[PDB]
């Protein structure tokens, strides 16, 4: 290690196109991260590359933390989590940049 953290934030409002995912995010919102892990922004020249890594690193950490407590994510959770983390990673790239 390590990775850099972002500050905890309010989990973002997201209008998912898939209606059932839209409702599922709201019902189960607290299952998802409210902060991101990443490699330093100044190691990237492009938002898209930063966000890709920020998503992979954050989802990895969150899934590992969850599995070792004996909890689980559904396939739906994973789809939503990736979107939520993407948004927070973008916010982190833009703020931090
Ligand atoms: Cl929240
Ligand atoms: Na709930």
Numbering used by the authors: 126 to 222
The paper states:
Pathogenesis in prion disease involves refolding of the host protein, PrP, from the monomeric, primarily α-helical cellular form (PrPC) to a β-sheet enriched, aggregated infectious form (PrPSc). Additionally we found that rabbits, a species with low susceptibility to prion disease possess PrP with a helix-capping motif in the β2−α2 loop, which appears to hamper the formation of the β-state. In the previously determined structure of wild-type rabbit PrPC 121–230, the sidechain of S174 forms a hydrogen bond with the backbone of N171 and vice versa, creating a hydrophobic staple helix cap motif. To test this hypothesis, we introduced the single mutations S170N and S174N as well as the double mutation S170N/S174N into rabbit PrPC 121–230, successively changing the rabbit sequence in the β2−α2 loop to that of wild-type hamster PrPC.
The structures of the S170N, S174N and S170N/S174N mutants of rabbit PrPC 121–230 were solved by x-ray crystallography to resolutions of 1.4 Å, 1.6 Å and 1.5 Å, respectively. The structures of the three rabbit PrPC 121–230 mutants show the same dimeric arrangement of PrP in the asymmetric unit that was observed in the wild-type structure published previously. In the crystal structure of the rabbit S174N mutant PrPC, the mutated N174 no longer hydrogen bonds with the backbone of N171, ablating the reciprocal interactions forming the helix cap and leaving the backbone of N171 exposed to solvent. The S170N single mutation reduced the rabbit PrPC ΔG of unfolding to 5.9 kJ/mol, while the S174N change and the S170N/S174N double mutant displayed ΔGs of 5.45 and 5.7 kJ/mol, respectively. At pH 4.5, the S170N and S174N single mutants form 54% and 66.6% β-state and the double mutant sees a larger increase to 84.9% β-state. Many susceptible species have asparagine at positions 170 and 174; by mutating the rabbit PrPC serines to asparagines we have shown that interactions involving serine-174 in the rabbit PrPC helix-cap are disrupted suggesting that this motif may be absent in PrPC from species that are more susceptible to prion disease. In support of this idea, Vorberg et al. showed that the N173S mutation in mouse PrP (equivalent to rabbit residue 174) imparts resistance against the RML strain of scrapie prions in a neuroblastoma cell culture model. The result of our urea denaturation experiments involving wild-type rabbit PrP and several of its mutants show that disruption of the helix-cap reduces the folding stability of PrPC.
